[PDB]
Amino acid sequence: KIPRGNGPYSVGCTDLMFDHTNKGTFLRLYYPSQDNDRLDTLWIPNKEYFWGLSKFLGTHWLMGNILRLLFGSMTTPANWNSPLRPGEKYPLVVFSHGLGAFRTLYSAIGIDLASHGFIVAAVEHRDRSASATYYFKDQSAAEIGDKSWLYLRTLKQEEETHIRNEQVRQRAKECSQALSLILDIDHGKPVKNALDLKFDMEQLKDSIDREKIAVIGHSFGGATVIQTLSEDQRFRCGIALDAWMFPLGDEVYSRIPQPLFFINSEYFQYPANIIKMKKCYSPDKERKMITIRGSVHQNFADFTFATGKIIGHMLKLKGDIDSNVAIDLSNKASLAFLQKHLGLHKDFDQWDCLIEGDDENLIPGTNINTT
Numbered sequence: 001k002i003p004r005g006n007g008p009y010s011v012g013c014t015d016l017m018f019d020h021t022n023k024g025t026f027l028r029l030y031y032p033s034q035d036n037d038r039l040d041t042l043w044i045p046n047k048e049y050f051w052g053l054s055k056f057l058g059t060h061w062l063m064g065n066i067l068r069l070l071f072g073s074m075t076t077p078a079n080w081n082s083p084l085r086p087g088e089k090y091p092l093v094v095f096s097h098g099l100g101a102f103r104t105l106y107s108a109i110g111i112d113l114a115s116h117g118f119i120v121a122a123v124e125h126r127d128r129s130a131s132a133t134y135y136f137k138d139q140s141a142a143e144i145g146d147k148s149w150l151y152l153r154t155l156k157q158e159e160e161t162h163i164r165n166e167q168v169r170q171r172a173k174e175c176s177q178a179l180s181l182i183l184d185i186d187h188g189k190p191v192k193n194a195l196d197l198k199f200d201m202e203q204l205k206d207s208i209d210r211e212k213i214a215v216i217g218h219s220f221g222g223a224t225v226i227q228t229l230s231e232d233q234r235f236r237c238g239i240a241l242d243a244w245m246f247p248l249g250d251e252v253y254s255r256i257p258q259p260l261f262f263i264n265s266e267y268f269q270y271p272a273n274i275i276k277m278k279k280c281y282s283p284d285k286e287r288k289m290i291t292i293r294g295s296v297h298q299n300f301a302d303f304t305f306a307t308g309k310i311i312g313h314m315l316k317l318k319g320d321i322d323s324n325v326a327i328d329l330s331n332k333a334s335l336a337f338l339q340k341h342l343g344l345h346k347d348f349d350q351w352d353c354l355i356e357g358d359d360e361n362l363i364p365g366t367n368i369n370t371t
């Protein structure tokens with residue numbers, strides 16, 4: 001199972017699409033909830049994501065059907081369309097997904113932050129980095145729910161520098177636009193959700209702690225973090241989970257005044273990537289980095305929870321470390337880092353020693369040698 005949150009808040013989940021176009025915002029919101037008696041959230045909600053995951057994997061098109069038979073009914077422990085818990089302003093996290101992922105594959109992170117009192121807006125990127133995503137051609141196509149699908153772009157070796165950079169910049173824009181949509185709803189903008197979902201967005205009016213905004217993402221998402229903080233100062237700190245540094249322009253490195261936290265797997269990282277992380281460091285800037293012992297790249301996404309230990313380990317969904325213990329360190333270190341650089345009046349500073357990598361399942365900085 002994808003773990004329930006460790007915080008005291010009940011967790012709710014809904015989807016938001018505004019506007020309906022390939023240029024709109026698409027997000028999955030995880031939020032502190034009033035009620036705990038709702039239907040659980042369907043983890044992968046459309047057959048077309050399974051198709052896209054199969055194209056991402058480069059497997060035979062029949063793997064789409066297999067993946068759908070195995071996982072098409074799986075849920076995650078968030079209350080679908082639960083009323084938002086009133087009477088409190090919540091800090092905001094914008095979450096960016098990896099290459100070949102989509103908005104629903106980081107519920108372990110999104111549920112755990114929500115259980116501690118954040119709203120999480122996990123964006124669905126329309127930059128063709130997602131396995132699949134969808135939008136509506138126009139108001140008519142939106143009305144009748146005639147979904148148009150967009151599938152992952154396969155790149156040639158020549159296309160990589162140029163297209164990965166064009167996409168990380170779209171990702172940054174999608175993070176800022178998602179932020180503006182949430183901030184406008186918090187004001188009280190009369191947003192009509194493109195999806196016919198029974199969660200009134202008017203709930204979120206005056207519910208965002210507007211000074212306490214952060215950007216978190218895994219992999220391509222980790223590079224999205226860095227690009228976003230460089231172009232949008234409304235974000236006050238970033239956390240890059242096993243960031244894939246390749247998409248970033250050489251210009252961005254010296255252009256991040258915000259606090260930034262690198263949380264790395266043991267077995268994903270390599271000299272080229274670590275050097276790019278080190279190009280982010282200056283004595284004037286706050287930087288922190290840890291490595292989770294025994295961990296793999298997939299430890300940060302929900303497929304680490306989707307199978308048994310033996311199959312998991314075999315497919316590199318799991319590492320030498322227990323997945324629950326792994327996500328636990330990443331989420332608790334994130335929480336203490338957020339409290340510190342957002343100025344939260346919570347108890348997350350109980351995990352400050354994780355920021356420093358002070359655990360037996362933690363390495364301070366990196367294992368990777370860069371000389």
Ligand SMILES: NS(=O)(=O)c1ccccc1
Pocket residue numbers: 097098099100101102105218219220297298301302303
């Ligand atoms: N590449 S990634 O972001 O690690 C990823 C994780 C889970 C599913 C698909 C992709």
Ligand SMILES: [Cl-]
Pocket residue numbers: 265267268296297298316
């Ligand atoms: Cl790995």
Ligand SMILES: [Mg+2]
Pocket residue numbers: 176231232233
């Ligand atoms: Mg900007």
